[PDB]
């Protein structure tokens, strides 16, 4: 009269499916999800410094569109541009908009330092009814619309050396009149020119006269350009008309700053990873929420689910 001793293993009534080398679906006792597929819908305001652009693009805040004046000298880890943002100043374009937006976003600051440029023999501080300030006409806060003094617009020739230990970002522009009447009326000369240079490089822009669609009352336009001046280098600006002058420079940093397009509201919570859909947790190695991310994020993948088996094969009774 003996005894029987049986070896065995556990099972559960309802297991989970995983993929292996040999099977697309095989049932195991337990598994854990490796793809983050959900978000709160909200961008957490810690631990990164979030700056809500509200009605303003970064570029409008950079240039100093009046409704964006509140952003003067603002800093961020992540600037958030909203789909409702609008421009409300002189109509303008930026050749290479994407790059200017990128480098400013990356600098992480709009900190501006006024410099005493000497514009001999021109009128400063031009304004337009397209860019209202208070009861009167106005202009971008960081730019200086220069026009004739009396009946002359001389050759403007100014220099500003960089004796600091940081990069200087200068924003400047060129005015494109709609008629010859307005070109000569504002700048005397029939054809302007703007030349902005450092020791090793230069940009020269010829203005373009001609009629364009009405924006905020105007057929004329400004084109925006930038020049970075490194420590020990020097800025020179040379122009016989159509210069939209800088008033100074923006102080550049390097660091972790960026920019994101999103309409997700900002909330008081803590999340390392931010997507345009909102913040997501970063406990899982992969995510399917959005390929656009900022912070300590799971890597984006196309799969909405991937299961890591955390137990043996399930063979129920």
């Amino acid at each position: 009269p003996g005894a029987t001793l049986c070896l065995g293993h556990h099972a559960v009534p309802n297991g989970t499916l995983v993929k292996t080398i040999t099977d697309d679906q095989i049932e195991v006792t337990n598994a854990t999800e490796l793809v983050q597929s959900s978000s709160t819908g909200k961008i957490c305001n810690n631990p990164h410094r979030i700056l809500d652009g509200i009605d303003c693009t970064l570029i409008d805040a950079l240039l100093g569109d009046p409704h964006c004046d509140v952003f003067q000298n603002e800093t961020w880890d992540l600037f958030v541009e909203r789909s409702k943002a609008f421009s409300n100043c002189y109509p303008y374009d930026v050749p290479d908009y994407a790059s200017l937006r990128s480098l400013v976003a990356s600098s992480g600051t709009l900190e501006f330092i006024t410099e005493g440029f000497t514009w001999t023999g021109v009128t400063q501080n031009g304004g337009s009814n397209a860019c209202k300030r208070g009861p009167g006409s106005g202009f971008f806060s960081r730019l200086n619309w220069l026009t004739k003094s009396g009946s002359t617009y001389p050759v403007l020739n100014v220099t500003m050396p960089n004796n600091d230990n940081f990069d200087k970002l200068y924003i400047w522009g060129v005015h494109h009149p709609s008629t010859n009447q307005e070109q000569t009326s504002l700048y005397v000369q029939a054809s302007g020119r703007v030349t902005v240079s450092t020791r090793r490089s230069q940009q020269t822009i010829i203005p373009n006269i001609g009629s364009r669609p009405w924006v905020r009352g105007l057929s004329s336009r400004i084109s925006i350009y930038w020049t970075i001046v490194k420590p020990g280098d020097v800025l020179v600006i040379n122009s016989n008309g159509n210069l939209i002058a800088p008033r100074g420079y923006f102080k550049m940093r390097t660091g972790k700053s960026s920019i994101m397009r999103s309409d997700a509201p900002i909330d008081t919570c803590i999340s390392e990873c931010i997507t345009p859909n909102g913040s997501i947790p970063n406990d899982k190695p992969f995510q399917n929420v959005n390929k656009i991310t900022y912070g300590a994020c799971p890597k984006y993948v196309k799969q909405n689910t991937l299961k890591l088996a955390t137990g043996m094969r399930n063979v129920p009774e």
Binding site: A3, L5, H10, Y300, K302, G311, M312
Partner: protein, 171 residues
């Protein structure tokens, strides 16, 4: 699995075992009973936790990157920006798929291996006092009271004590 215990010579698992992953069912003189084997349960869990913690190692912190959505058609530069991102995503998606497949095959095989290891450890403990029925169960060829079963399970079974009795019952 590679060892052929789980979903092999062991017909099925035990839903009733809720205090461990592997273990013992016995029928003796005094009735039936069940106990978890802690050591083999722990080895499997510990290996699975080890691999889980390797996979969830936070390794990616990225700040300013490229644009990945575009409001205007541009041509060449945008084609490249998109192609770069789409290449990246495909390569990581592949890594993720391969990772789980290799990990999961390996998890199934190590759990199968732990079962088999417990079965052989037990067979070796019992020396000539028992026989492998071939279905995960040993027929023991002697009187094995509840004290004797616990001795097999808790690792203290002296086979010499029951050997003469058992050898004769076998032959």
């Amino acid at each position: 699995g590679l060892f052929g215990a789980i979903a092999g010579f062991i017909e099925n698992g035990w839903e009733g075992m809720i205090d461990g992953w592997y273990g013992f069912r016995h029928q003796n003189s005094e009735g039936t009973g069940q106990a978890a084997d802690l050591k083999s349960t722990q080895a499997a869990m510990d290996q699975i936790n080890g691999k889980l913690n390797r996979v969830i190692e936070k390794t990616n912190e990225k700040f300013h990157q490229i644009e990945k959505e575009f409001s205007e058609v541009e041509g060449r530069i945008q084609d490249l920006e998109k192609y770069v991102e789409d290449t990246k995503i495909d390569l990581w998606s592949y890594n993720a798929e391969l990772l789980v497949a290799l990990e999961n095959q390996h998890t199934i095989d190590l759990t199968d291996s732990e079962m088999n290891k417990l079965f052989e450890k037990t067979g070796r403990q019992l020396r000539e006092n028992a026989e492998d029925m071939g279905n995960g169960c040993f027929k023991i060829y002697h009187k094995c009271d509840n004290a004797c079963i616990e001795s097999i399970r808790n690792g203290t079974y002296d086979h010499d004590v029951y050997r003469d009795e058992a050898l004769n019952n076998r032959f």
